[PDB]
Amino acid sequence: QDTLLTLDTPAAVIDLDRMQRNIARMQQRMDAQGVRLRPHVKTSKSVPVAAAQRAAGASGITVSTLKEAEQFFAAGTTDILYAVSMAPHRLPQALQLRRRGCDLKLIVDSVAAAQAIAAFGREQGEAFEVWIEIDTDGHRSGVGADDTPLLLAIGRTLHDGGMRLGGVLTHAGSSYELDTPEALQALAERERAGCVQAAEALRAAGLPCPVVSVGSTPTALAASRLDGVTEVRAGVYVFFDLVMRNIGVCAAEDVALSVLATVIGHQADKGWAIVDAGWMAMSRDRGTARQKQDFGYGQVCDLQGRVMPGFVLTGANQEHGILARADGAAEADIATRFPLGTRLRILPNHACATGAQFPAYQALAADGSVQTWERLHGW
Amino acid sequence: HHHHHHAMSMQDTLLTLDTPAAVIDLDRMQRNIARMQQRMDAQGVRLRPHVKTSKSVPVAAAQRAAGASGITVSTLKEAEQFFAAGTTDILYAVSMAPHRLPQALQLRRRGCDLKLIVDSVAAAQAIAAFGREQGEAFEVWIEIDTDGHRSGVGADDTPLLLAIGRTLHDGGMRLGGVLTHAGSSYELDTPEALQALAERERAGCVQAAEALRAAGLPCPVVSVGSTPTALAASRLDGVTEVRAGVYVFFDLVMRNIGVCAAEDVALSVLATVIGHQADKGWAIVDAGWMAMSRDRGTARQKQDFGYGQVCDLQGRVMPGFVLTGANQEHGILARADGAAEADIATRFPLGTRLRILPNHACATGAQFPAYQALAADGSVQTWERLHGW
Numbered sequence: 001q002d003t004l005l006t007l008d009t010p011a012a013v014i015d016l017d018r019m020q021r022n023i024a025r026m027q028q029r030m031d032a033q034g035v036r037l038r039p040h041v042k043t044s045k046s047v048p049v050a051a052a053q054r055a056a057g058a059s060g061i062t063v064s065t066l067k068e069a070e071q072f073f074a075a076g077t078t079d080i081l082y083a084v085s086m087a088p089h090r091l092p093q094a095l096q097l098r099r100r101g102c103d104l105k106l107i108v109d110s111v112a113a114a115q116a117i118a119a120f121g122r123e124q125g126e127a128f129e130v131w132i133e134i135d136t137d138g139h140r141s142g143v144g145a146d147d148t149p150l151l152l153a154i155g156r157t158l159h160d161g162g163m164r165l166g167g168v169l170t171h172a173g174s175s176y177e178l179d180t181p182e183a184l185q186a187l188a189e190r191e192r193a194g195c196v197q198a199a200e201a202l203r204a205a206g207l208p209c210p211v212v213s214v215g216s217t218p219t220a221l222a223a224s225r226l227d228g229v230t231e232v233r234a235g236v237y238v239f240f241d242l243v244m245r246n247i248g249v250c251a252a253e254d255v256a257l258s259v260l261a262t263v264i265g266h267q268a269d270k271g272w273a274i275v276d277a278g279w280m281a282m283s284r285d286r287g288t289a290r291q292k293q294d295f296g297y298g299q300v301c302d303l304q305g306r307v308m309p310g311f312v313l314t315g316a317n318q319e320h321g322i323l324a325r326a327d328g329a330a331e332a333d334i335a336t337r338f339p340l341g342t343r344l345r346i347l348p349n350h351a352c353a354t355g356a357q358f359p360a361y362q363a364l365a366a367d368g369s370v371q372t373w374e375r376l377h378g379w
Numbered sequence: 380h381h382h383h384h385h386a387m388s389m390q391d392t393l394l395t396l397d398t399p400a401a402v403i404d405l406d407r408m409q410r411n412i413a414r415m416q417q418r419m420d421a422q423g424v425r426l427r428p429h430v431k432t433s434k435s436v437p438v439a440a441a442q443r444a445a446g447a448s449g450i451t452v453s454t455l456k457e458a459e460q461f462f463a464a465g466t467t468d469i470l471y472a473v474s475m476a477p478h479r480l481p482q483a484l485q486l487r488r489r490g491c492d493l494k495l496i497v498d499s500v501a502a503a504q505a506i507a508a509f510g511r512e513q514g515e516a517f518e519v520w521i522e523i524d525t526d527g528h529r530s531g532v533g534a535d536d537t538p539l540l541l542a543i544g545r546t547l548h549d550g551g552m553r554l555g556g557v558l559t560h561a562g563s564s565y566e567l568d569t570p571e572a573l574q575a576l577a578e579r580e581r582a583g584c585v586q587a588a589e590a591l592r593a594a595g596l597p598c599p600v601v602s603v604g605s606t607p608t609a610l611a612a613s614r615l616d617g618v619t620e621v622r623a624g625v626y627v628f629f630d631l632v633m634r635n636i637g638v639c640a641a642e643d644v645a646l647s648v649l650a651t652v653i654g655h656q657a658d659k660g661w662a663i664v665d666a667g668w669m670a671m672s673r674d675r676g677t678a679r680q681k682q683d684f685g686y687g688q689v690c691d692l693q694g695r696v697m698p699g700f701v702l703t704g705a706n707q708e709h710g711i712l713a714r715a716d717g718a719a720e721a722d723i724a725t726r727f728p729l730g731t732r733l734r735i736l737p738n739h740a741c742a743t744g745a746q747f748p749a750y751q752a753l754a755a756d757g758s759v760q761t762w763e764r765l766h767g768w
């Protein structure tokens with residue numbers, strides 16, 4: 001019988017009741033907007049996490065690598081969008097997945113990448129499904145939402161080239177820089193409007209564009225309306241994290257992934273407890289540093305998961321985390337409060353970064369038992 | 380020659396690997412291994428490399444073949460993997476947690492000469508009571524704080540050293556030594572300050588061992604080291620071994636501390652260009668922070684390299700171009716000086732392969748299930764490494 005007292009530390013624990021509440025909150029919001037949810041599994045890369053998202057009503061998945069496409073397809077999921085601008089050298093891998101039965105969709109934002117796909121498809125007998133990525137907020141990839149000549153030149157390359165022009169997609173990743181409901185709502189409207197504008201421009205040119213796909217977790221939870229959109233992609237919401245708490249779309253109490261750690265020593269004069277969760281456990285992500293409340297390398301909670309405001313990991317080496325007062329003072333008699341061997345749970349800055357440090361999650365049930373749920377590492 | 384012809388057909392190079400990949404330039408790696416071992420031989424001290432930078436059996440095998448004595452590990456899973464691969468002299472250099480004692484016992488009962496460390500009377504009492512119960516005289520070293528980096532017993536705290544050392548010795552354990560790590564060396568960037576810190580690290584660790592021996596307690600090993608202080612110490616009188624790990628590859632944090640050049644950096648991430656934002660001067664590559672890690676140790680140093688220094692496919696630095704930003708699977712390649720490069724698409728065409736030098740080799744390596752060990756003939760081989768605990 002494995003439980004939080006028996007596991008070695010550090011371990012990545014998913015509180016299944018918290019995870020199920022986050023899954024239902026997002027699916028209920030997408031149902032209220034009349035759109036499909038295509039979760040981004042790059043947050044967990046774990047078959048049972050994605051199975052719970054499917055069981056609640058999700059439609060297909062988004063993946064960040066073809067390794068995730070291979071994993072999820074070998075587990076029976078066939079409706080897979082690889083939402084990273086396609087590199088031509090990966091075309092043989094993509095072809096072999098489609099010929100095996102995976103309905104794998106690729107994305108592009110240039111004439112040259114569309115040309116490479118379409119020439120390879122014609123040669124190989126494969127009508128690849130490709131969507132066009134639209135830049136709606138200046139974050140990263142994509143055809144500018146008002147760069148119509150580029151949008152139509154790519155769309156005609158794919159459609160006249162014998163490929164299946166399946167849709168447009170955008171990701172308003174600048175939402176991570178926001179922290180008010182008004183700014184998130186307005187960005188969610190800019191994301192929706194730009195993605196719909198590109199679809200209408202394709203359709204107006206006589207090109208197919210059946211899918212309009214938007215999303216980030218903060219804009220998926222903030223959008224007031226989603227007219228014109230067929231699906232939303234969101235991923236970090238399945239666990240949440242402290243970055244999301246500071247953006248304002250969840251509370252710390254909603255964060256379903258924590259790192260179980262043991263106190264292995266102290267520095268009494270500085271008021272430090274040293275734990276065995278360093279940055280190799282937490283990752284080096286320090287997304288909260290650029291936000292209105294800095295949580296260091298994570299927020300401390302007790303073994304029951306009660307948040308302990310005011311204690312955070314103020315520093316981290318590879319295998320040692322430094323727990324101390326966030327107010328800078330040296331806690332008096334820190335060893336008397338957290339004796340050697342005490343177990344604590346640390347909430348992460350960024351769930352996608354912390355999860356990737358572990359070979360598996362420990363999925364925590366209501367009775368206190370855990371089941372190990374493997375996840376993917378690498379490419 | 381059936382095996383030959385098939386092996387040739389299957390052989391990878393930097394053109395045929397999928398990206399991103401973590402590439403070890405084996406010539407650079409061997410130059411780093413010989414440099415550290417020669418330095419320690421010249422100092423008359425053993426080198427006990429810290430394998431937590433690579434966690435890879437062939438990398439440790441190269442360090443052992445060059446003359447290393449034992450290893451340091453950061454987790455008991457590293458002690459399990461390297462003992463199964465034939466390494467018997469292993470120091471687990473993280474404050475021992477009582478609940479890990481059954482795994483440390485099982486490793487010693489299989490034949491691993493595993494050493495543990497402590498820095499408190501309670502951890503010493505837990506080891507000694509488990510060892511008496513189980514009939515095992517564990518070997519334990521006392522960790523010393525010589526530069527305020529983390530924690531450890533103060534080198535001048537005779538009453539706490541004696542109490543921890545008597546708890547282990549009177550308890551029937553083998554008090555085997557003292558160790559320190561002057562991790563504050565990562566904040567320095569001059570040879571004068573590094574040499575001084577390495578002397579403070581030596582002096583304080585020997586001071587602790589001299590105090591234990593003055594009370595009649597054994598303390599035969601005195602172990603010091605970080606890569607920067609190993610390379611800078613003038614003298615090592617009284618020290619029996621040095622531990623250093625990131626030197627096997629180096630990285631840009633080390634280049635900035637000034638103990639290596641960018642051309643000594645033996646680990647790089649092979650990446651492909653997958654797109655552009657022409658008006659911002661950006662090339663997008665498939666090495667984001669999941670490949671590089673989120674480490675940004677160069678941001679507070681003399682030269683900020685973002686998420687890494689861009690090199691061409693031949694490994695040569697392309698000055699002025701860095702990964703200025705990174706999302707999980709996408710890295711943003713742009714000018715470090717903040718200008719928008721003109722014709723970025725012509726400077727970096729779609730499908731171009733590049734190599735990115737890491738901020739911190741320990742952090743970048745852990746993002747990969749294996750390295751691709753690049754030989755002089757351009758051939759790679761997959762060298763697995765450990766992930767997790």
Ligand SMILES: Cc1ncc(COP(=O)(O)O)c(CN[C@@H](C(=O)O)[C@@H](C)O)c1O
Pocket residue numbers: 040062083170171173176215216217218233234235236237706707708709
């Ligand atoms: C293309 C694409 N679609 C959906 C998501 C999921 O966003 P959430 O994690 O906010 O739900 C992402 C996430 N991208 C991360 C990243 O590191 O790439 C970031 C840009 O916001 C995505 O890229």
Ligand SMILES: Cc1ncc(COP(=O)(O)O)c(CN[C@@H](C(=O)O)[C@@H](C)O)c1O
Pocket residue numbers: 317318319320429432451472559560562565604605606607622623624625626
């Ligand atoms: C206990 C111990 N010994 C040796 C080293 C190796 O130092 P280099 O990597 O500089 O050769 C370390 C390294 N510790 C890292 C860390 O992330 O823990 C840091 C404090 O320098 C060490 O801890």
Ligand SMILES: [Mg+2]
Pocket residue numbers: 236350352353707
């Ligand atoms: Mg994320």
Ligand SMILES: [Mg+2]
Pocket residue numbers: 625739741742
């Ligand atoms: Mg390191």
Ligand SMILES: [Mg+2]
Pocket residue numbers: 008768
């Ligand atoms: Mg284990």
